[PDB]
Amino acid sequence: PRRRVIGQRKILPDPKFGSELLAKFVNILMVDGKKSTAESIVYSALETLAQRSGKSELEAFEVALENVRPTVEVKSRRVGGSTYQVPVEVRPVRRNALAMRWIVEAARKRGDKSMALRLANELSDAAENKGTAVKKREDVHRMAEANKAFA
Amino acid sequence: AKQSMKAREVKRVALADKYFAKRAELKAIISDVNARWNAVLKLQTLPRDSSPSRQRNRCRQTGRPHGFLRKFGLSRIKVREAAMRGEIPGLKKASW
Amino acid sequence: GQKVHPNGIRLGIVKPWNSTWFANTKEFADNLDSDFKVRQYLTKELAKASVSRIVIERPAKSIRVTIHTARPGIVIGKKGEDVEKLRKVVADIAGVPAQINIAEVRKPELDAKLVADSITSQLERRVMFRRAMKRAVQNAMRLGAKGIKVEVSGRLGGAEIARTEWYREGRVPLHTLRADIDYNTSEAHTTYGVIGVKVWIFKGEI
Amino acid sequence: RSLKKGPFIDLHLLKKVEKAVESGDKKPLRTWSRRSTIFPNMIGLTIAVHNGRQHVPVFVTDEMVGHKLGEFAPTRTYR
Amino acid sequence: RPKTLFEPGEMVRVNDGPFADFNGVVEEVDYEKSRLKVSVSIFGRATPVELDFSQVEKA
Amino acid sequence: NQYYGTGRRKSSAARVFIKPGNGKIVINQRSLEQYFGRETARMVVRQPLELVDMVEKLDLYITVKGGGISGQAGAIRHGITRALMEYDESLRSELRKAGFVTRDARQVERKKVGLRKARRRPQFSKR
Amino acid sequence: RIRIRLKAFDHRLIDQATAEIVETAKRTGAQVRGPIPLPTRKERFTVLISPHVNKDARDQYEIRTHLRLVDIVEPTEKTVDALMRLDLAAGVDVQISL
RNA sequence: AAGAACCUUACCUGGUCUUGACAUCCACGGAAGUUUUCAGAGAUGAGAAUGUGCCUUCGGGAACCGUGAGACAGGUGCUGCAUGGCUGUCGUCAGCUCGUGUUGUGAAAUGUUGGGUUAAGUCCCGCAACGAGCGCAACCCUUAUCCUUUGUUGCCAGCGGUCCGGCCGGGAACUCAAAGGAGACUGCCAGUGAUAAACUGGAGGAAGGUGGGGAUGACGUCAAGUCAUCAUGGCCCUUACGACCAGGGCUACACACGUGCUACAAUGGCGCAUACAAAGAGAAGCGACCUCGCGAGAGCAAGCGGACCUCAUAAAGUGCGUCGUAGUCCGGAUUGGAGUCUGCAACUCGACUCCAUGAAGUCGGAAUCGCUAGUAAUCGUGGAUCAGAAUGCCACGGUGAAUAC
């Protein structure tokens, strides 16, 4: 804000696995205030992915977020017509935040029949660097590098 | 003031008890059959104008048919006029 | 209309309400009719007597009318000669036994409605409004309450355009809820039309 | 739409139907009411239904089984 | 108490209620539950009180 | 003898009576896992008791009404924290750091005239 | 047994009305229980404020009708002939159920 | 406009009335009232009935009814650029003035500003200005915590006894309910700042820098809206711009625009079972229970003018079975047939129920709106108006975010 900086309302760990990142994940994925239906699809997709892939439940979303975790962000420095994309090292809160927003938007975009399938497919395709969220991450880095007038 | 609406309404009040409210129940029992017979025609001879359905609720003071409130017997600007000047008992502002 | 109205909030917390009677809501309207049908009458009859404040309470089987005024004598009369005919018709319009009590109050200029009707009576007699307004505020502030203002509006000075004019002596904290402020309105009438008078009087605090 | 237990025919118009049993078919009758129901005992009448500005002469037939007089009276106007 | 049968609009006397040594009128009667809805005009206002048939006498 | 705590969460109301015994919880004359412990708000009631490790020490008889699943569990949460005075106060001093001793001031804001709800304003025209 | 029920328009009028109702029965000699709260009714009224053009502005008023229940336990001869007629509470609608 | 089938209704087509539909006053005769007959769409004209009560100094009142006459009454007629009153709006942004003193021939200037600080003309320092008034915080209401008083129509922890029903002793502890108090006042410490105001962190506390929300909108502005809520100057109508009655219009249709609601789906559709509310209203009322009809609803039929009785079964949620990306078991438009409820009466122009029909629509161009935390979003409940009729207005709660570099 203008008068002072304000950090968004802090959250507590999730009731099932005790992770503060999964709490933010289910909150962003939630629709119409129905947290129960949201976490039900998140846990169902995570369990089906951990069973299908054969990896641990921790790495089933940590490596999937890691492949969509950016290392640079864009600053609007006005050089290219009152807007620009100067690159700078992303802060950790923003680093995991942009990754979650992209993988959730990719799950919304995916054409699979069930949201559990759309999420388990984006989570699978992300970790092998082929998903839609990977395309989003590997397009902004190119645009930021192309618009690197300053650093 | 528009004396017409007040005159019509005052006339309908007395005439809606002079003919209606006593023989209307007979129409409700016979015409809307409860246990066609020919006794129904004699109960449709009531006055068309004097019917309670025609009666429109109006303000006690000015006869305004819109904005009326049945409980206080006045209109919203009349309730506001008395309410602001402290003439309605305990009608304090709502500030919860 | 942005200015705050004091009589809707002062009578709830610091001042007592002008209608303390309790009645049933299911028959409130008819009772309200009988309540208002004598307040117009008392306003008409006590126009020559210059009424200052009335508090009427109707328990639904009797009606207690309490009246304040400059001179209780003209209203009561010699031993009750005048007041009996007023009580008779009030008891006939309301249908219940009327109890009328006129209280003696020294210096009635500290009440808004008295000064309001006084200026209104001076506007029908065609005398100057500025001198009438100045005396109405001057011989009320020096004699008592810590603040008074009178805002007249409407065809002032015989002009063909709308205007406002007002004097303010002392201080009137109108947005202060604990302030005891008496406020009434009065509409005069002349050939130019209706003139609106508003008077605020601030006596003290709780 | 219509009355539940029987066709409501207007009182004065019922008097006109009773006088029509004795007087038979006649010239168009300009009445003001439109709240009457059609039935087999009403076929053959040549009454004129009111429509504000004018009175439309309607001839009753079998095809008007549940309609009222007001469904044949032009009140509004088209361009 | 005598005069066990009552009728609407008749004056009675309160004996077992808080309004003893005073009279009043019954606005509504309930013969089914045998309860009298009597009002006492005290302080200028109506005061609904419940009375039994056998406890009070007709005036 | 008994250890009591009321607790409230925005619409709900509970009476948490802590009696010595087994580690089970009785809520509305029914078990914990049956009512909602296998679904939403499963372990929020356990967060005050997790810090002190009272696993089989005290039985809780609770009667709660009002609100919904979260509201009832929040009333049970504030009831347990209010009823945590059973022994010496050296354990609630660490429970304050967790943030459950504090009564939440998060309550619904009223609807206002001209608005569809608490803060939503009607759509403004483009021109 | 004497289920007194009071109905008033002000919070500082009904507790004072039931103060004499408790004192003029407790002192003379009877069995009396304290006043039951009996929840206050809040009646709201929302009306349009402007006379000729008013789309989203309204003025909101309300009335709080207070209630009380004394419920005298034993109707002894001392309280039957001394309880009422002395409070002068004209703004309290008393109702009594036996 | 917080309710247009007639009425409402002001507007229109026809039928009528002129001291009148409403009011003061004069004269004359008649108790008022309750009856029906013919004609007309009715307003209404034209007859046949019955009664003559209370009570007066019998001048026969006091009530009312009919006729006649003038003074007159009446108008939601015109003008919110002749007005009162009320209201939107700038804007709850922190501003706006009065006494002296002083300066300039004077309009005017200072005060009303330079430095910190806050939401604030809030406070302090500095200082040719010193003081005061309106406004802001401030006194009001609710919420967040505790104590005292208080237990029926509300409740059942420590206790037991039975219809296993708080139902009954008892407790009145306490869920809840409602009066009176206490508590938050930069107060406690440290640091910073000027040693002043003030700021940051920590402790206590349920809550620290007006804890959260609401009410309350300065001097003034738009000749802003309302002669149609009412009042009112001037002007106009007066066997007519007045008044009554039936029907019609206010709902039309080659169109444009605003505010809203429902959709385009497997996050969901259908079917069964099941858990938890708050705020209100209710006597020509809410209408249990029982029976009939698939049903909308009808008949019979308790309780209460209200923590008792009813509206009222809270819904999203959660378990399974079904359908698998289709113009589909998505979504329902339009139309026909057959009914129910209110009301003289559903007639252009109403609600709801049953059967049949299943348009458009694949998240929408340019553009644009609302929201900083219990908010946005989503799902239900009640109320005003209401003979009977809301996706609008007002109010209440369930779940409950995202994001601020």
Curated annotation (Swiss-Prot), chain A:
Superkingdom assignment: Bacteria
UniProt keyword rRNA-binding present: yes
Function according to Swiss-Prot or TrEMBL: One of the primary rRNA binding proteins, it binds directly to 16S rRNA where it nucleates assembly of the head domain of the 30S subunit. Is located at the subunit interface close to the decoding center, where it has been shown to contact mRNA. Has been shown to contact tRNA in both the P and E sites; it probably blocks exit of the E site tRNA.
Keywords on record: Ribonucleoprotein, Ribosomal protein, RNA-binding, rRNA-binding, tRNA-binding
Name the UniProt record assigns to this protein: Small ribosomal subunit protein uS7
GO BP annotations listed: cytoplasmic translation; negative regulation of translation; ribosomal small subunit assembly; translation
GO molecular function: mRNA binding; rRNA binding; structural constituent of ribosome; tRNA binding
Further comment: The strain K12 sequence is shown. Has been predicted to contact the N-terminal domain of IF-3 based on footprint studies; exactly how IF-3 interacts with the 30S subunit is controversial.
GO CC annotations on file: cytoplasm; cytosol; cytosolic small ribosomal subunit; membrane; ribosome
Family: Belongs to the universal ribosomal protein uS7 family.
Subunit (UniProt): Part of the 30S ribosomal subunit. Contacts proteins S9 and S11. Cross-links to IF3 and the P and E site tRNAs.
From Swiss-Prot, chain C:
MF terms in GO: mRNA binding; rRNA binding; structural constituent of ribosome
PROSITE patterns, sorted: KH_TYPE_2, RIBOSOMAL_S3
Keyword annotations: Ribonucleoprotein, Ribosomal protein, RNA-binding, rRNA-binding
One of the record's GO cellular component terms: cytoplasm
GO biological process: cytoplasmic translation; ribosomal small subunit assembly
Signal peptide: none
Superkingdom of the organism of origin: Bacteria
Matches recorded under InterPro entries: KH_dom, KH_dom-like_a/b, KH_dom_type_2, KH_sf_prok-type, Ribosomal_S3_C_sf, Ribosomal_uS3_bac-typ, Ribosomal_uS3_C, Ribosomal_uS3_CS
Domain KH type-2 stretches: 38-106
Family, similarity comment: Belongs to the universal ribosomal protein uS3 family.
Assembly notes: Part of the 30S ribosomal subunit. Forms a tight complex with proteins uS10 and uS14. With proteins uS4 and uS5 encircles the mRNA as it enters the ribosome, which may play a role in mRNA helicase processivity. Some nascent polypeptide chains are able to cross-link to this protein in situ. In collided ribosomes contacts ribosome rescue factor SmrB.
Function: Binds the lower part of the 30S subunit head. Binds mRNA in the 70S ribosome, positioning it for translation.
Name of the protein described by the UniProt record: Small ribosomal subunit protein uS3
Origin species: Escherichia coli (strain K12)
UniProtKB/Swiss-Prot annotation, chain F:
PROSITE patterns the record matches: RIBOSOMAL_S9 (PS00360)
Protein name: Small ribosomal subunit protein uS9
Keyword terms, alphabetized: Ribonucleoprotein, Ribosomal protein, RNA-binding, tRNA-binding
Gene name per UniProt: rpsI
NCBIfam families for this protein: PRK00132.1
Coiled coil location: none
Claim: Chaperone is one of the keywords in the record: no
Family of the protein in this entry: Belongs to the universal ribosomal protein uS9 family.
GO biological process: cytoplasmic translation
GO molecular function terms listed in the Swiss-Prot or TrEMBL record: RNA binding; structural constituent of ribosome; tRNA binding
Subunit structure: Part of the 30S ribosomal subunit. Contacts 16S rRNA. Cross-links to the P site tRNA and weakly to the A site tRNA.
UniProtKB/Swiss-Prot annotation, chain G:
Pfam families per UniProt: Ribosomal_S10
Molecular function in Gene Ontology: structural constituent of ribosome; transcription antitermination factor activity, RNA binding; tRNA binding
Gene3D superfamilies reported for this sequence: Ribosomal protein S10 domain
SMART domains noted in UniProt: Ribosomal_S10 (SM01403)
Record flagged with keyword Protein biosynthesis: no
Matching InterPro entries: Ribosomal_uS10, Ribosomal_uS10_CS, Ribosomal_uS10_dom, Ribosomal_uS10_dom_sf
Keywords, sorted A to Z: Ribonucleoprotein, Ribosomal protein, Ribosome biogenesis, RNA-binding, Transcription, Transcription antitermination, Transcription regulation
GO annotation, cellular component aspect: cytoplasm; cytosol; cytosolic small ribosomal subunit; small ribosomal subunit; transcription elongation factor complex
Entry's family note: Belongs to the universal ribosomal protein uS10 family.
HAMAP family xref list: Ribosomal_uS10
Function: Involved in the binding of tRNA to the ribosomes. Part of the processive rRNA transcription and antitermination complex (rrnTAC). The complex forms an RNA-chaperone ring around the RNA exit tunnel of RNA polymerase (RNAP). It supports rapid transcription and antitermination of rRNA operons, cotranscriptional rRNA folding, and annealing of distal rRNA regions to allow correct ribosome biogenesis. In complex with NusB is involved in the regulation of ribosomal RNA (rRNA) biosynthesis by transcriptional antitermination.
Protein name: Small ribosomal subunit protein uS10
